[PDB]
Amino acid sequence: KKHRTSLPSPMFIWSILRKCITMPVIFNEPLSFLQRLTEYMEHTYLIHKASSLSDPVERMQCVAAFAVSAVASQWERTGKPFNPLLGETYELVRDDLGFRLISEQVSHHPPISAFHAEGLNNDFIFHGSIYPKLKFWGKSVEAEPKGTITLELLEHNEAYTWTNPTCCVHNIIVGKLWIEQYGNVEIINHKTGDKCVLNFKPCKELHKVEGYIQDKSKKKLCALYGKWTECLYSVDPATFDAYKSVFIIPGSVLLWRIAPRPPNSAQMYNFTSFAMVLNEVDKDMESVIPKTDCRLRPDIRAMENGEIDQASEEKKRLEEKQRAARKNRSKSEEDWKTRWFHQGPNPYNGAQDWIYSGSYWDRNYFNLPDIY
Amino acid sequence: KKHRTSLPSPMFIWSILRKCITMPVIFNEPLSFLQRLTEYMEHTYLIHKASSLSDPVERMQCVAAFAVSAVASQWERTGKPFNPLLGETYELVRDDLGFRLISEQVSHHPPISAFHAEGLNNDFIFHGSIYPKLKFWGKSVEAEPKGTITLELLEHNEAYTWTNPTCCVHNIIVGKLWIEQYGNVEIINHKTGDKCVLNFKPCKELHKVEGYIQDKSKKKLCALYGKWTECLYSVDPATFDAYKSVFIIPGSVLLWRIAPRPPNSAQMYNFTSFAMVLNEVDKDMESVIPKTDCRLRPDIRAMENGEIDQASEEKKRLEEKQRAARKNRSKSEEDWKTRWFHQGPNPYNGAQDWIYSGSYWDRNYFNLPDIY
Amino acid sequence: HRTSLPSPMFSRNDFSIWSILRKCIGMELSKITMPVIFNEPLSFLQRLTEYMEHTYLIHKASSLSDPVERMQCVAAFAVSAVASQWERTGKPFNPLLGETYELVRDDLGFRLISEQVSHHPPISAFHAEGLNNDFIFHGSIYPKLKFWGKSVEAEPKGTITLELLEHNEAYTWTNPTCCVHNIIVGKLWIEQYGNVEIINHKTGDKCVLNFKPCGLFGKELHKVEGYIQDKSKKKLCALYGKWTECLYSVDPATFDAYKVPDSESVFIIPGSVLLWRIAPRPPNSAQMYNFTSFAMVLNEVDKDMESVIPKTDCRLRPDIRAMENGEIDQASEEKKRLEEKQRAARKNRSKSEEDWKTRWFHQGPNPYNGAQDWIYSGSYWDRNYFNLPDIY
Amino acid sequence: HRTSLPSPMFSRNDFSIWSILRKCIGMELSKITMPVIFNEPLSFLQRLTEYMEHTYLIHKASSLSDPVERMQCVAAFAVSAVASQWERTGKPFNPLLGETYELVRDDLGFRLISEQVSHHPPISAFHAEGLNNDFIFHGSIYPKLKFWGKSVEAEPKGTITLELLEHNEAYTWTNPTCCVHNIIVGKLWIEQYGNVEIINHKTGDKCVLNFKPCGLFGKELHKVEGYIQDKSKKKLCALYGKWTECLYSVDPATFDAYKVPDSESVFIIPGSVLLWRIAPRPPNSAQMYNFTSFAMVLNEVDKDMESVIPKTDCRLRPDIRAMENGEIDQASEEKKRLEEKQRAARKNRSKSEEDWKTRWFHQGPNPYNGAQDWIYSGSYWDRNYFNLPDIY
């Protein structure tokens, strides 16, 4: 009996390692991204002011003031908001600031959140969608709210479009996490031909916003300066040029000052007084709001309750039921239907945009997505 | 309508990270651990020699020579052998070296491998079990073959027990992997009262084995020196004392020299000529060997074929079917039964030991474990 | 003898413990060097010079008196400047603060001097002049790297400036972004995209080049589509093609009439005029880190250079030499060594509180777009080098 | 101008690429420091001295003339020497090469001098003398750490030697292993196990102490069971108990008649005689890194010590000071600093090729078991310190 003196094949990539080897809720804040998007509304008084003004230059100031304000609550809000489930809605009615705002998570890959806002007196519509495109930039993560933001001043037959600056989270790997916001922002008034430029200057000039307003002719009509953590000012351009808390240039005009976060704040995730109301519920509101409102979302619920262990268990559950829901539509050939926004041309730029489908505030909700 | 000014719970371990965040076959050699255990037999001629000798001192030399030889093929065998499945058997009959050896993987937690060897002329039995207890020691892994090894010389009414030294794999994290073997080894001849001490010296004196033989009275009768990678020698103790490849002390006696690895070797995982036969099959052997022989194990099969991708897929499958098999017995209250070894007193030490159940070489296999 | 330690042990249940795990893990993490094994034997300062490969297009434009016909050559140069990128998944060495690279070609009619002008952020400034005194090509590149998913982006932040001296006119543009797909997991492939505007600041002529992204099914891979328009926004040319291969030009009105992945063939619109075609890579290419012949010249040295060039020149950079000589084992040790000499120099300059001095470039506004830029400080081609920094 | 690089690019498909990933990853990995956050404000040289807490047992044995009755006191000392381990899941600082620790207690009748005598392997040598000139307690400890599963083992390799000078007799033993269960995942708990043989080399008396392991359901946790036997292997005593609390002794024949987890109560076999009982930890304990009162004295300092003690003494160790003062944030920076000063000293001694000199200990055989050991070189209590190494 004769045996073999050699092996058949002589002795001799990441695939093997990949095949054979979520986010911690301790890094979230108790807010859906949709709710973090409604903080855009924190200073809706500027919109209402804008609508009551005759001169479009003065009107562009308040919209410029408002655009800065809608991204102003983010200082020290280093908690990531929960990525909204597909079909997650969120509504907010505020009787004092005079608006209603429905938002719906439209897609999940990529994550797109659609929102529609209306003044209660029918003076404005505010709408758009946001994809927060996350990019690891060095030792920091960038979030970039991709998407146009459209504000229609109904009493004035005009609409303003713009996009938001980039929101950067530094020291994400090491050090005290902190928020920067930089980018340039053009506000086009599509009736007048008026343009407003807002540079959110990057860091010294921390939080520094500088910019100007010009007519369609391209004549500057005022400069705009301040910090998105505090305030914006308008001033005559000629004296702003010569003259480069906050440095108050002579004869400037206060356009906006940040709303109030409570002394309780740094114990409550640095939420504003506006933010503290976002995720609240009560027996009345339970009957009316739909089953997709993120006020009925157990993990944000349980985290706001302190039950963090129950929050991370509940979070992984929804995400899993959401994959599973995707794979059944992946096979059953059904494809997802957006209850409250449909897709369509933005008429002021011709760029695809999500468009409110109507009928939300009628209630009588029917066949809603069962996403919890 | 009045809203809330604070959250219910103020804002505020590894569990979350653990719950919400195999071995690569590229690190194995194509051998079951059971097969790597049969390399103990590579020099069974020393056993047969031992059995033909009248003087037990001379007999203790050959058993000491054999004990060193059974762990000598491990130099440069830096490939881990596949952890044997529960129920994996392995048989080897060699007509020239004169033995049969059945081994069976007895348990999996911990991994215990049982083996029984018999000389074909009924001159010896060689048996024991091995648990290779792995410990990460610094920049190296230690494997320690826990368990007694019992060699019975049937023509001489005697039995020797001993345990194996520790097998250390250096530079496991960084550098060229390489094998060291260290430890002290006592060989007790239980009839004569004779003892043989083998120190496997740790590293300079790389692979250095030194030791002695003494009677029950505790009189040294010879020294024993050499290297487990090459050879062992006996020499008069009096001249070994005075006198401290290999340093040949005057008037020494060659007890053993390592068997032959082929020039092909370093292309074939550094297997010996003995090792190259272990995992071989053929149409004859297929009819006879049981369904648990690791010659019928697909991943060791496919890896020996070079099909490494198919090997790592096939490996994870068996391990998974093995967990699944465990969890069904975890519920169905069935518990695993060892086909060929039962547990019992080692009579020469009173220490629990696995004991051959008989009947293996009768074939007529019945109801064997379906482990592939 | 005391009954207590001066301060109780600090608690694990309180989350104050992992922010010191945070502090110590990152002091270790940022220490680590990127393995030479993902680099290619090129300093970014050298990768920057490949812009110049097709300088014959600047010379073409220098000698055309139709402004738009000059624009068609600058756009040709803009597209060609980024063409060598295809299949260049090696990451050129980040240049050490103080690194220079000079390249003189007489067959091509230019001489170029680059300096690594800052290390955080890593900014490369370059200045190239025509030898017939017919252009200045100058600017700066800050490669902003961004990871996500499987992809790495490098956005080259910076204004690039072609001044055609014989026409008293100057073009500015900003290059497209370069994506590298399937890092770690899969086969690497290179994509370039982003809108490039080229402006003739004299005439008001605007070139729009949209480097189209892959899109679904990989259909628009490498496609480049755009126009040239006059100061009043009327299209005079359509431009199209792939930036890996060719740029065509054609009547705008007819272009409107016609409106690891593999690229699509260029459909040659009737009446097109080829502006630029790539010179194919040598058969050395896929074995030679996918260099073009031009790229294989950059780190070449003779002792006739080593006397003339300054000591800072990256042709004298050891780790890039080690890697090119195949000694990749040494190259990560040379890399390790240089990245610590540079730390030590800069911390040393903090205990001393001295500001670092760029030898060949200074800061100043771009007079064409008001951006802050980097401007040649002169005297580089004098030789007479003095007090240069010791960086190797 | 060359047409190729001097050497083709080396391939990823060939597995020659990851062994340079291997080379570079480990040069980074072994650099990293263990976070101070798992340590406790004690040098191992100090953790070593806690053996001495119950020296009153040596003094008991020094003054007994029945040899076996002396054995019952050495075994009492052996068990007591390892008692403070319970709930000590902080890992004492690995002592720097050159570290010493001295401890003088007159209330306890001993004076001890330890030196860290090698860094790889980390070997601690110690020598303690009775002040009444009645014993020498000396030996060395190499803590061989071994990880697997959730558990870390520290096997203290070394021979420990009690010479009772008034009886011309000497005991040798080797301590048990100390397991730490549920590292990272779960609550840490400490277990000691291993067979300890104590030999009276004069009389031939053997003490066997089996520190029993936990076993299934945690039933034998901390139990210690053994006997004392004469030179002809006859049991004169059974010993039993838990090493956390007590050691009893009893007629051997009656003991045979009786043959995070919580421990079991000690069943007090009729006719037992208590040999040793632990002194309970203070209520400070669980807040004070679970020190016993003795352990809380070790790093204590007065300026009256800092003049007398040498500069190497670990009471003068900064990172251990930082940690004890609560400044744990600084302690990992002091740790970082010291572990690199020590590397730099030893590599420096390689460029110079000089061998390191232990000041207070030298190597030599143990005359009792032939093992190689560490032996006091004298002169430590003279003071008159000279040329000591600068290690802080």
Numbering used by the authors:
A (entry chain B), B (entry chain B): 531 to 542, 549 to 557, 565 to 746, 751 to 791, 823 to 950
C (entry chain A), D (entry chain A): 533 to 791, 818 to 950
Q: Can you list sentences taken from the study reporting this PDB entry?
A:
Members of the OSBP/ORP family vary in length: the short ORPs contain primarily a conserved OSBP-related domain (ORD) that can bind and transfer lipids such as sterols, PIPs or phosphatidylserine (PS), whereas the long ones often possess additional functional domains for ligand binding and/or membrane targeting. The OSBPL1A gene (homo sapiens) encodes two proteins: the long isoform ORP1L (residues 1–950) containing the ANK (ankyrin repeat) domain, the PH (Pleckstrin homology) domain, the FFAT (diphenylalanine in an acidic tract) motif and the ORD, and a short isoform ORP1S (residues 514–950) containing only the ORD. Here, while we cannot rule out its cholesterol sensor function, our structural, biochemical and cell biological data suggest that ORP1L is a bona fide cholesterol transporter. Here, our results suggest that ORP1 is a unique sensor of lysosomal PI-bisphosphates, and that PI(4,5)P2/PI(3,4)P2 allosterically regulates cholesterol transport by ORP1.
Nevertheless, we solved the PI(4,5)P2-bound structure using the direct mixture of ORP1-ORD and brain PI(4,5)P2. The binding mode of PI(4,5)P2 acyl chains is distinct from those observed in the PI4P-bound Osh structures. Nevertheless, the PI headgroup of PI(4,5)P2 nestles in a polar surface at the tunnel entrance, similar to that in the PI4P-bound Osh structures. The 4-phosphate group of PI(4,5)P2 interacts with the highly conserved His651 and His652 in the β2–β3 loop and Arg901 from helix α7, and the additional 5-phosphate group further interacts with His652 and the 4-phosphate group. The inositol ring and 1-phosphate group are engaged in contacts with several charged or polar side chains from the α4–β1 loop and α7 helix. Intriguingly, the inositol ring of PI(4,5)P2 is accommodated in ORP1-ORD with ~180° rotation compared with that of PI4P in Osh proteins; otherwise the 5-phosphate group would have caused a steric clash with helix α7. The rotatable property of the PI headgroup provides the possibility that ORP1-ORD can bind other PIPs such as PI(3,4)P2 that stimulates cholesterol transport as well. More significantly, the presence of such a charged, protruding group (5-phosphate) should interfere with the closure of the lid, which is likely to be very important for ORP1 functioning as a PI(4,5)P2- or PI(3,4)P2-dependent cholesterol transporter, similar to the case of another LTP32. Indeed, substitution of residues involved in PI headgroup recognition severely affected membrane targeting of ORP1-ORD. Last, cholesterol and PI(3,4)P2/PI(4,5)P2 (the PI headgroup) bind to the lipid-binding tunnel and the tunnel entrance of ORP1-ORD, respectively.
